[PDB]
Design an enzyme around this catalytic site. Structure first.
Site, short mmCIF file in Angstrom:
data_model
loop_
_atom_site.label_atom_id
_atom_site.label_comp_id
_atom_site.label_asym_id
_atom_site.label_seq_id
_atom_site.Cartn_x
_atom_site.Cartn_y
_atom_site.Cartn_z
N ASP B 61 0.84 -1.19 0.00
CA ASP B 61 0.00 0.00 0.00
C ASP B 61 0.88 1.24 0.00
O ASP B 61 1.75 1.39 0.85
CB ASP B 61 -0.91 -0.02 1.22
CG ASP B 61 -2.10 0.90 1.08
OD1 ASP B 61 -3.05 0.55 0.35
OD2 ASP B 61 -2.10 1.97 1.73
N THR B 94 -3.53 5.07 -3.88
CA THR B 94 -2.59 5.88 -3.12
C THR B 94 -1.20 5.91 -3.74
O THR B 94 -0.40 6.77 -3.38
CB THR B 94 -2.50 5.37 -1.68
OG1 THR B 94 -2.22 3.97 -1.69
CG2 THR B 94 -3.80 5.61 -0.96
N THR B 95 -0.90 4.98 -4.65
CA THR B 95 0.35 5.08 -5.40
C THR B 95 0.18 5.97 -6.62
O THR B 95 1.10 6.71 -7.00
CB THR B 95 0.83 3.70 -5.81
OG1 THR B 95 0.74 2.80 -4.69
CG2 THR B 95 2.26 3.75 -6.29
N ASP B 391 -8.63 -2.44 1.20
CA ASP B 391 -8.70 -1.75 -0.09
C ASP B 391 -9.89 -2.24 -0.90
O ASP B 391 -10.68 -1.45 -1.43
CB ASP B 391 -7.41 -1.98 -0.87
CG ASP B 391 -6.29 -1.06 -0.43
OD1 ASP B 391 -6.50 -0.26 0.51
OD2 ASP B 391 -5.20 -1.13 -1.03
N1 LIG Z 1 -5.40 -6.96 -14.26
C1 LIG Z 1 -4.78 -5.77 -14.45
N2 LIG Z 1 -4.15 -5.50 -15.61
C2 LIG Z 1 -3.53 -4.33 -15.81
N3 LIG Z 1 -3.48 -3.35 -14.90
C3 LIG Z 1 -4.06 -3.49 -13.70
C4 LIG Z 1 -4.76 -4.74 -13.40
N4 LIG Z 1 -5.25 -4.61 -12.15
C5 LIG Z 1 -4.89 -3.39 -11.69
N5 LIG Z 1 -4.18 -2.72 -12.62
C6 LIG Z 1 -3.62 -1.36 -12.48
O1 LIG Z 1 -2.97 -1.15 -11.23
C7 LIG Z 1 -3.06 0.24 -10.91
C8 LIG Z 1 -3.11 0.46 -9.40
O2 LIG Z 1 -2.13 -0.34 -8.76
P1 LIG Z 1 -2.46 -0.93 -7.31
O3 LIG Z 1 -1.16 -1.16 -6.58
O4 LIG Z 1 -3.42 -2.06 -7.52
O5 LIG Z 1 -3.30 0.23 -6.58
P2 LIG Z 1 -2.68 1.59 -5.99
O6 LIG Z 1 -2.94 2.61 -7.06
O7 LIG Z 1 -3.44 1.79 -4.70
O8 LIG Z 1 -1.22 1.30 -5.78
C9 LIG Z 1 -4.32 0.75 -11.57
O9 LIG Z 1 -4.02 1.93 -12.31
C10 LIG Z 1 -4.74 -0.33 -12.54
O10 LIG Z 1 -4.85 0.22 -13.84
#
Ligand SMILES: Nc1ncnc2c1ncn2[C@@H]1O[C@H](COP(=O)(O)OP(=O)(O)O)[C@@H](O)[C@H]1O
Ligand SMILES: Nc1ncnc2c1ncn2[C@@H]1O[C@H](COP(=O)(O)OP(=O)(O)O)[C@@H](O)[C@H]1O
Ligand SMILES: Nc1ncnc2c1ncn2[C@@H]1O[C@H](COP(=O)(O)OP(=O)(O)O)[C@@H](O)[C@H]1O
Ligand SMILES: [Mg+2]
Ligand SMILES: [Mg+2]
Ligand SMILES: [Mg+2]
Ligand SMILES: [Mg+2]
Ligand SMILES: [Mg+2]
Lengths: 98, 528, 526, 232, 532
Positions: B61, B94-95, B391
């Site tokens: 996170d 949050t990233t 989350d």
């Molecule tokens: N199956 C997937 N394929 C491609 N991109 C993904 C997939 N699942 C999530 N993402 C991407 O991951 C990004 C967010 O990363 P994550 O670490 O899950 O959340 P956070 O933004 O809180 O760090 C989102 O912009 C989303 O587009």
């Protein structure tokens, strides 16, 4: 105007362009600057806005007073002239209401 | 400069103003963004932070990592604050907020070095962000059918997308189903305190379960507890806030007697008070007795003699969940223990879970609460599982509020970048450069995804740009096939408010950082 | 283990702070000696780190005795030294002018004017300043001794020697006139080498005089020699009059018993031969920069010759110039032309508890000494400084016979001329032009302030007077604090001094206005 | 590569972001993974000599000088004074295996060490670690299905304790009580079967009191169908 | 694992660190560029003060401990040695190249591709400059040299006084022209002696139509002015003769000691008489002269100077036609000095310059020489004036040697950026990006020029780029290649018309050197720093 990041003696951030807040969070040590700050805070308490105007006008007045002292005028004459001009400005001000 | 016999500010004050301090602020923001750069995407990696005490926190996170980092740079703290803001308002992204803010600042740094007035940059950011938010609201896909099956599928897909970046991504379908079930059975306010999260060491991830009721750990049983039956088939639960043990009647009470018969009468009166409370509880027909206050050994043995179950010192949150599941009322007095204030569950049972004893209340048909029991091999394993589930739960709650989804994987941001570039190509030209820089900065997320996955980011970005230019709103990075795909058809769904809040917070942070021209740092007081 | 792109001790400062600091440093240097200008100036006591006391009101000495850390202050000190070396007067004036121009430049720097514009305006102003100064000058007849004495007086009215004005003026004028020398079509004065100032504490200052010759702190080697020769024939030398080792290694080897005595006798014979070669010219006085052997003294006394040894090279050159002698190194090559005839008296007399040698009646001497008698060493040092200023002013007038009105009249005239010229530019650099033009008023203002009169009233009256047509010679009386015509008061200055002051002040302002970065702490790396 | 970042800004003015950043450390990228794999391999290789009937005990000494000669993996790792975080993860893994099952606390550590050792050479060939984790998960699913396939069922009746006795003997074979092996297995089986809810329900270990007293011989250990009280 | 006794940095960390070091060095001197640039004041921790604008001097005085910054410092030094001008521009260009290349690398572009693109871009930039942006000086005349000198002296302490200083520089450079074999007119700068002496203003700086010695006559008895000088240049001391190490005097009969001692000085007396018998008036020696020989010269009325610097003596001998004589020994085994070995001059004087004296050899024959006496306000001013004057002399030498000049004021960078941005589309797939970033990096010079003037850098550079794009697109608008920056008004201006010229070699060499430095630093991806 540009905001200023001011950190007091307690790591409390103050990002602002409010003159009174900046002065309050600044550790002013010189006594004359302390009196100017106190005048600014009095303006803030009385009206609520115009503190930066207070500092700008007071500073300009003091630099021009130094110029007048250097060219030859005495402190008393400068003070009397400033008082007369302040009275004249206060007299003029109501006529400028739009 | 000069000594100035009487100095203006206190000695030791550090001042920095002009372009150099703004450039330094941008560099510090870059440093902060680098700390969470590799945590983004299904190929993201966790970070381990050790505090002074020696405890290690392992997290993916972004908000957690930034909080554990002890940032003291005044400009860099804005990114931590916006990460916290995104976590509070949305719960995911949050990233993305930090990456976007840092990329905005990096893109406008060359123009700042040329002496461009910061107000122009701020105005350009505000205009671009307003346009981007309007575009997101306009092109977000929503279904006006209110179909239960479709709504459940949408929530499940959003939960899976929110989960496919954490160490529990292998069981993302399982945990998404659990989270959707929990949120749907939450009643009307979706209070997070109504979803219990219990972490029990040992066992596989698939051993984790969601209780259609309430479950809590065994609470310091007294002597004679092992003689109480540990299973009931239709118990009535008495939720009490009462200390059931012999004790002083009141703190300031003081008994004065001058006769031995009065002494014996007083002793028997204390015993009769306790036994009267116990008889009032027993005659209510209840079989399970739960209290927020200690239950003594005498009461424990009394209940064991009646084939009753007792558990004192239950945490208040657990009693609230038991009240919301079984459907009784917490009673501070036992004088009126009617059937209205008695809970009811289909089955109560105490079972062993990995070296711990838990009390289970199952079969509640109208329960408004849940209890996640998470299994794993380490304390940090369960902690990160809880963070990921949090989350997912926040995403599902927000999607319950409004079912406005946008395809993820960088597709939404590539579309926004194309739209912003098209808009910027039709304005005078001072704002054109800055809006183009904003649009180019909106490309950081797919590029970071490709970089984390080990791809070649440039080729994927070129393909995405061409695809968006020639048509196709929802084409994003396909991590598994190392190509691009229609992420809407791949069920990579994101609630629109996630991106809306991300863009808003990143823009506000960038504007605030750019607006500052001078940094003044007062000397420390009481250094000790 | 920090990365340390630069060294740990390297500090960088940049921006408006650097310019403000430089201008404030220049202002501070000016304020140190602001009060040491004008006839009514007050003296200052400087404590030498070695333990001595320097009591003076000369600007250059005061600035030279001060150690400073800010490099702008170092630049100002170097400016003072340059002004002192080039012309010998106007040190306080140039320091004050540089400070004033830097102040009026800071005025514009505080606004959004680039320093290059200010520098260009300053250079144009300096050109017009030079033009006007050359315009308002007057010629001088150097033959008229009275006018030269008046000029020297006007130079020394502001020093502690002003009480004895005519004496000092005559001393300086005579010394310069008889140190003036021309040879091979080249003219020179050379106050530095010749025209020595010798100070003997005690006596009274009225007894000070410049001698038609030289005086050294030396005595005869042997008491039998005469201490008073009427019309001596002086012969000067460099080589020792004693047996010396050769340049090469020259070990001897004695195997016969009579060779030792023979060698010693040859040493004596060599000394006798040298003395006979000297005596062949029939001199009366022999001066040597090196030792004279006792046997040589005997051989010279046999011929009734006074001998003085271990005389400094500078003193010996001064003697040669004074008495028309030529220094020779090998007595066998001594010629008649090298014998110094022209000294009219040589006398060794005791002053206090010490002997002094006088060669003080030379006809047409090209070198001289100035004998200063006074209360103490510090008083005599200040008198020597004042007399050096007088001699430098006299030499400047002799080289350049142009004069310029003093008492601040020239400053006001040039300021008015530049102000009138500025009315036609109608550009953006007219404002720095006018500011640096009016910055010249700091000289009359300082004169009034030191005099004690009202500054504002007197400057207003002076400006109004200068707005008229023929009023370029109206300045401030330094004593009464009244506006008087300087052709009536008689205070005038050499044009060279004014030109050098104006040029140096403007160029210092240009140099310091140009800096905007300061980096310090780096190693010498020699 | 270590301590994090250090620039002090391109303008020379101080550039400090994290408190005490000059006193902290940072490992990133592949070398962090290699260090973790090396630490886990060290722990697993230390533990693997105590695996099986011919395993050898480890003599653990705590901070007070008290000695604990033991073969249990969870106990050994619990009493081990480690500072590396991955070693703490290994200790927690052993504790988890002990809590959930109670046996096999040494096999988990050796298996984890072997898995990380193989993942090291997989990483050296340019495979993303997430790919390695996904492949490990797939293979673990396959292995678990195979175990379910090749598993065998035993009777847990009280009138025939032979399979239970054999299982307890297999568990005890690696311990020092293998001298009294059959008696120990017998008493353990009888203790569990006596206090248990027969409908495949839980076994309350609070109803089994394990009491030790020095003297006598190890063969004198017996199961008492009552309570032994330390009073008189 | 490694067990190396030292610290190690690898990957993005070391690359970003190197970029930071280079950027810091560039930012140190970025404020001293162009006519609106401002000088710096260096304090050397013992009170020594150096006020300068020259990039090489600033970088040499600074003590640096990061090796990439050292690379840029030596880059500036090399540019100074090989060209003499553009020392700040090369450093700034190299640092910007490094910044943009590192950005490309961080975008996962392999550094080899960036290096190849930079090499191609540098080659094409040099080719385009030589083919389109050069102006021949044949059709301009002396005005071209004057304008080049004036442009060089902008951003210097003598910038405003260019109308006078450029004439001085051009006259001094043309006064030392000599033609070697192959008929190539070469101009040996550094043969112009530069003397510094505070005093009058800069306008009183003098151009000597001869040579100036920082020396005086050894004896006050000698004359200080000789009309028809016959200079005799010697390289041996005139002192009492002392026998060598291998010769030792041993006396057995005392009668010979006086003869030995007399001959010890009679040898030098005979040498002096042999030199003087040819009519020599001025005698210059690198060695010393003792009092005896000084008196010998005094009696003959001849000027004698001792401890003359060897380079000064060589220049005087070459200019006046004299010959250095380390010894008096002909091929007959004798000891003689013939009158044919004497130089001549129209006058030799000892003038007074601000309480000091120096010797002027006026109007030497058989070759014309030159020297410059710089008058300032103090020592720091004179030193900075000397540095700026040397820059101007080097610029004039480059212009006269190679007769091609290029418009100044950022015109060349803008034209190159437009051309390279257009040209990159026809080369490679990633070297395309590298060439585009090279073109973008080339624009740092006009940006810095505009910023130093507190002008609108973005709009001014955009207008410059539009002008150059129109010049490169419309075949009939090719006269816009000369449009540069007029910093006084903050507007684009035809710099070729305005006379803002500078040698082509400056841009060519600066581009080559900056590309070399950027390639060298960009190649590093790992650092090992062993503990001392
Ligand atoms: N199956 C997937 N394929 C491609 N991109 C993904 C997939 N699942 C999530 N993402 C991407 O991951 C990004 C967010 O990363 P994550 O670490 O899950 O959340 P956070 O933004 O809180 O760090 C989102 O912009 C989303 O587009
Ligand atoms: N009698 C006088 N009345 C008015 N002004 C005078 C008189 N004598 C000298 N001055 C002025 O005083 C100044 C001399 O000051 P001084 O102490 O000599 O400074 P500096 O040593 O720098 O020349 C001159 O500018 C001159 O105009
Ligand atoms: N009069 C002028 N107008 C516009 N630009 C100029 C002028 N003179 C010089 N320049 C430009 O300013 C740039 C910086 O020159 P400068 O930094 O002083 O030389 P160096 O790089 O040798 O220190 C040069 O590239 C030149 O093209
Ligand atoms: Mg307000
Ligand atoms: Mg997420
Ligand atoms: Mg004076
Ligand atoms: Mg086992
Ligand atoms: Mg240059």
């Amino acid at each position: 105007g540009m905001n200023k990041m001011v950190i007091n003696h307690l790591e409390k951030l103050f990002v602002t362009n409010d003159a009174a807040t900046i002065l309050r969070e600044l550790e002013v040590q010189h006594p004359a600057a302390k009196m100017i700050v106190m005048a600014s805070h009095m303006q803030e308490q009385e009206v609520g806005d115009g503190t930066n105007f207070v500092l700008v006008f007071a500073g300009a007045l003091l630099e021009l007073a130094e110029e007048l002292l250097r060219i030859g005028l005495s402190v008393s004459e400068v003070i009397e002239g400033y008082e007369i001009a302040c009275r004249k400005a206060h007299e003029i001000l109501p006529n400028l209401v739009c | 400069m000069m000594p100035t016999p009487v100095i203006l500010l206190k000695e030791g004050t550090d001042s920095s103003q002009g372009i150099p301090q703004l450039v330094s602020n941008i560099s510090a923001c870059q440093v902060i963004a680098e700390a969470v750069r590799t945590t983004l995407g299904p190929r993201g990696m966790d970070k381990l932070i050790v505090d002074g005490r020696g405890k290690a926190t392992i997290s993916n996170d972004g908000a957690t990592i930034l909080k554990l980092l002890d940032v003291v740079h005044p400009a860099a703290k804005t990114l931590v604050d916006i990460a916290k803001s995104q976590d509070a308002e949305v719960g995911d992204g949050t990233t993305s907020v930090t990456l976007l803010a840092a990329e905005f600042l990096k893109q406008v740094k060359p123009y700042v070095e040329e002496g461009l007035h910061p107000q122009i940059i701020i105005r350009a950011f505000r205009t671009a962000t307003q346009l981007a938010v309007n575009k997101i609201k306009e092109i977000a896909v929503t279904v006006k059918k209110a179909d239960k099956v479709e709504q459940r599928k949408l929530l499940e897909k959003c939960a899976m997308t929110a989960l496919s970046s954490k160490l529990i991504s292998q069981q993302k379908a399982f945990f998404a189903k659990m989270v959707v079930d929990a949120v749907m059975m939450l009643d009307d306010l979706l209070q997070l305190k109504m979803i219990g999260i219990k972490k029990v060491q040992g066992g596989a991830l698939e051993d984790s379960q969601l209780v259609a009721g309430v479950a809590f750990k065994k609470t310091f049983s007294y002597a004679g507890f092992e003689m109480q039956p540990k299973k009931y088939h239709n118990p009535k639960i008495a939720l009490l806030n009462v200390e059931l043990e012999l004790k002083a009647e009141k703190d300031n009470a003081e008994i004065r007697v001058h006769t031995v018969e009065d002494y014996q009468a007083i002793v028997d009166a204390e015993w009769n008070i306790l036994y009267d409370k116990l008889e009032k509880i027993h005659h209510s027909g209840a079989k399970v007795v739960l209290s927020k206050l200690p239950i003594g050994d005498v009461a424990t043995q009394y209940f064991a003699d009646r084939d009753m179950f007792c558990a004192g010192r239950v945490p208040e949150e657990d009693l609230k969940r038991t009240m919301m599941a079984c459907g009784g009322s917490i009673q501070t007095s036992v004088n009126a223990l009617s059937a209205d204030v008695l809970g009811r569950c289909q089955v109560f049972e105490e079972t062993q879970i990995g070296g711990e004893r838990y009390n289970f209340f199952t079969g509640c048909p109208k329960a408004k609460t849940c209890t996640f029991i998470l299994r794993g091999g380490a304390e940090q394993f369960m902690e990160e599982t809880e963070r990921s589930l949090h989350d997912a739960i926040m995403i599902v709650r927000r999607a319950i509020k409004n079912d406005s989804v946008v395809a993820g994987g960088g597709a939404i941001e590539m579309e926004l970048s194309k739209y912003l570039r098209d808009y910027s190509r039709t304005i005078p030209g001072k704002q054109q450069l800055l809006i183009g820089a904003y649009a180019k900065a909106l490309e950081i997320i797919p590029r970071q995804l490709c970089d984390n996955a080990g791809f070649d980011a440039t080729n994927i970005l070129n393909k995405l740009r061409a695809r968006h230019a020639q048509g196709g709103t929802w084409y994003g990075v396909d991590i598994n096939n190392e190509d691009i795909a229609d992420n809407f058809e791949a069920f990579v769904w994101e609630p629109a408010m996630v991106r809306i809040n991300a863009l808003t917070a990143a823009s506000e942070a960038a504007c605030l950082i750019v607006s500052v021209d001078e940094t003044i740092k007062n000397p420390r007081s009481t250094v000790d | 283990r920090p990365v340390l792109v630069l060294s740990q001790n390297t500090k960088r400062e940049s921006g408006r702070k650097v310019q403000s600091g430089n201008i404030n440093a220049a202002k501070t240097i000016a304020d140190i000696i602001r009060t040491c200008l004008g006839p009514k100036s007050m003296m200052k006591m400087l404590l030498d780190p070695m333990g001595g006391i320097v009591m003076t009101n000369d600007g250059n000495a005061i600035l030279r005795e001060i150690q400073v850390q800010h490099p702008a202050a170092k630049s100002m000190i170097e400016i003072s030294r340059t002004q002192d070396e080039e012309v010998g007067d106007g040190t306080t004036s140039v320091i004050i002018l540089a400070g004033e121009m830097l102040s009026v430049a800071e005025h514009f720097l505080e606004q959004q004017m680039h320093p290059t514009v200010v520098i260009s305006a300053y250079r144009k102003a300096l050109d017009d300043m030079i033009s006007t100064l050359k315009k308002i000058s007057i010629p001088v007849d150097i033959s008229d001794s009275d006018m030269m004495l008046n000029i020297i007086n006007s130079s020394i009215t502001t020093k502690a020697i002003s009480r004895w004005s005519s004496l000092a003026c005559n001393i300086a004028l005579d010394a310069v006139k008889m140190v003036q020398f021309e040879e091979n079509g080249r003219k020179e004065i050379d106050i530095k080498k010749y025209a020595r100032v010798e100070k003997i504490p005690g006596g009274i200052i009225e007894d000070s005089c410049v001698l038609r010759g030289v005086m050294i702190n030396k005595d005869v080697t042997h008491p039998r020699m005469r201490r008073y020769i009427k019309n001596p024939r002086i012969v000067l030398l460099d080589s020792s009059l004693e047996y010396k080792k050769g340049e090469s290694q020259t070990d001897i080897e004695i195997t016969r018993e009579e060779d030792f005595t023979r060698i010693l006798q040859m040493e004596e014979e060599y000394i006798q031969q040298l003395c006979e070669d000297i005596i062949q010219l029939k001199p009366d006085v022999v001066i040597t920069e090196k030792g004279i052997s006792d046997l040589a003294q005997h051989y010279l006394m046999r011929a009734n010759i006074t001998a003085i040894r271990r005389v400094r090279k500078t003193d010996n050159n001064r003697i040669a110039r004074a008495c028309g002698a030529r220094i020779v190194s090998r007595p066998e090559e001594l010629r008649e032309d090298d014998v110094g005839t022209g000294a009219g008296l040589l006398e060794i007399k005791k002053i206090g508890d010490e002997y002094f040698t006088f060669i003080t009646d030379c006809k047409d001497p090209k070198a001289c000494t100035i004998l200063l008698r006074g209360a103490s060493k510090e008083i005599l040092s200040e008198v020597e400084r004042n007399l050096q200023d007088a001699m430098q002013v006299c030499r400047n007038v002799l080289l350049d016979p142009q004069l310029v009105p003093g008492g601040g009249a020239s400053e006001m005239a040039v300021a008015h001329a530049l102000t009138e010229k500025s009315k036609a530019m109608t550009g953006v650099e007219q404002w720095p032009y006018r500011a640096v033009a009016q910055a010249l008023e700091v000289i009359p203002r300082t004169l009034i302030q030191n005099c004690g009169a009202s500054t504002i009233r007197l400057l207003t009256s002076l400006r109004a007077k200068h707005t008229q047509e023929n009023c370029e010679t109206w300045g401030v009386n330094g004593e009464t604090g009244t506006l008087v015509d300087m052709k009536e008061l008689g205070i005038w200055e050499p044009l060279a001094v004014k030109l050098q002051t104006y040029k140096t002040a403007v160029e210092t302002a240009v140099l310091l206005l140009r800096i905007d970065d300061i980096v310090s702490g780096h190693k010498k790396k020699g | 590569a270590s301590m994090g970042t250090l620039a002090f800004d391109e303008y020379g003015r101080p550039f400090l972001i994290i408190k005490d950043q000059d006193r902290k450390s940072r490992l990133m990228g592949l070398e962090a993974l290699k260090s973790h794999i090396m630490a886990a391999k060290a722990v697993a290789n230390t533990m693997r000599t105590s695996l099986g009937p011919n395993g050898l005990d480890k003599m653990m000494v705590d901070k007070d000088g008290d000695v604990t000669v033991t073969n249990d993996g969870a106990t050994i790792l619990s009493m081990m004074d480690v500072d590396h975080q991955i070693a703490k993860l290994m200790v927690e893994l052993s504790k988890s295996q002990d809590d959930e099952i109670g046996d096999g606390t040494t096999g988990v550590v050796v298996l984890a060490g072997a898995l990380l050792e193989e993942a090291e050479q997989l990483l050296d060939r340019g495979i993303h670690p997430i790919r390695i984790a996904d492949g490990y998960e797939q293979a673990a699913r396959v292995a678990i299905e195979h175990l379910d396939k090749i598993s065998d069922s035993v009777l847990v009746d009280i009138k025939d304790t032979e399979p239970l006795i054999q299982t307890a003997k297999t568990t005890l074979g690696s311990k020092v009580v293998n001298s009294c092996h059959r008696q120990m297995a017998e008493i353990a089986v009888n203790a569990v079967l006596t206090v248990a809810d027969m409908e495949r329900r839980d076994v309350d270990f609070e109803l089994i009191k394990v009491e030790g007293k020095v003297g006598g011989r190890l063969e004198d250990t017996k199961l008492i169908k009552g309570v032994i009280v330390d009073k008189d | 694992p490694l067990s190396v006794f030292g610290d190690r940095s690898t990957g993005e960390t070391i690359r970003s660190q190197n970029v930071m070091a280079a950027a810091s060095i560039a930012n140190i001197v970025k404020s001293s560029l162009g006519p609106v640039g401002l000088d710096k004041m260096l304090v050397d921790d013992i009170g020594d003060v150096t006020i300068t604008n020259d990039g090489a001097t600033i970088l040499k005085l600074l003590e640096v401990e990061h090796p990439a910054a050292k690379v840029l410092c030596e880059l500036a030094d090399l540019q100074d040695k090989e060209v003499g001008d553009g020392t700040t521009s090369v450093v700034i260009i190299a640092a910007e190249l490094l910044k943009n290349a590192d950005e490309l690398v961080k975008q996962k572009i392999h550094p080899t591709s960036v290096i190849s693109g930079y090499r191609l871009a540098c080659k094409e930039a040099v080719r385009y400059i030589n083919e389109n942006l050069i102006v021949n000086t044949d059709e301009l005349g002396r005005d071209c040299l004057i304008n080049a000198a004036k442009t060089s002296m902008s951003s210097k302490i003598i910038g405003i006084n260019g109308d006078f200083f450029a004439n001085m520089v051009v006259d001094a450079v043309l006064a030392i022209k000599y033609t070697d074999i192959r008929g190539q007119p070469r101009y040996p700068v550094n043969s112009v002696n530069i003397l510094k002496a505070h005093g009058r203003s800069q306008m009183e700086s003098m151009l000597i139509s001869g040579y100036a010695l920082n020396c005086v006559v050894g004896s006050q008895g000698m004359p200080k002015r000789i009309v028809n000088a016959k200079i005799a240049c010697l390289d041996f001391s005139l002192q009492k003769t002392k026998m060598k190490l291998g010769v030792q005097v041993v006396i057995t009969d005392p009668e010979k000691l006086d003869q030995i001692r007399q001959r010890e000085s009679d040898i030098t007396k005979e040498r002096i008489q042999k030199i003087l018998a040819t009519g020599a008036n001025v005698i210059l020696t690198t060695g010393g002269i003792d009092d005896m020989c000084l008196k010998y010269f005094v009696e003959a009325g001849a000027m004698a100077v001792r401890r003359v610097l060897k380079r000064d003596l060589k220049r005087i001998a070459k200019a006046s036609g004299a010959t250095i004589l380390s010894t008096l020994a002909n091929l007959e085994g004798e000891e003689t000095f013939e009158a044919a070995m004497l130089g001549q001059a129209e006058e030799v004087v000892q003038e007074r310059i601000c309480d000091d004296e120096l010797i002027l050899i006026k109007n030497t024959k058989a070759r014309t020489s030159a020297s410059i006496i710089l008058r300032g306000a103090n020592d720091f001013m004179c030193d900075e004036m000397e540095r700026s004057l040397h820059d101007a002399l080097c610029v004039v030498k480059r212009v006269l040697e190679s007769k091609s000049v290029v418009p100044g004021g950022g015109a060349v960078e803008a034209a190159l950026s437009i051309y390279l941005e257009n040209y990159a589309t026809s080369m490679g797939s990633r070297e395309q990006l590298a060439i585009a970033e090279f073109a973008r990096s080339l624009l740092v010079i006009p940006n810095t020029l505009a910023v130093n003037a507190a002008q609108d850098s973005t709009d001014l550079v955009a207008k410059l780029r539009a002008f150059h794009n129109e010049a490169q697109v419309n075949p009939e608008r090719k006269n816009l290649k000369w449009i540069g920056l007029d910093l006084s008004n903050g507007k684009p201006r035809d710099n070729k018309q305005a006379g803002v010229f500078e040698p082509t070699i400056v841009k060519v060499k600066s581009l080559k050197f900056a590309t070399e430095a950027a390639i060298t630093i960009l190649r590093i991806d790992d650092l090992i720093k062993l503990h001392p």
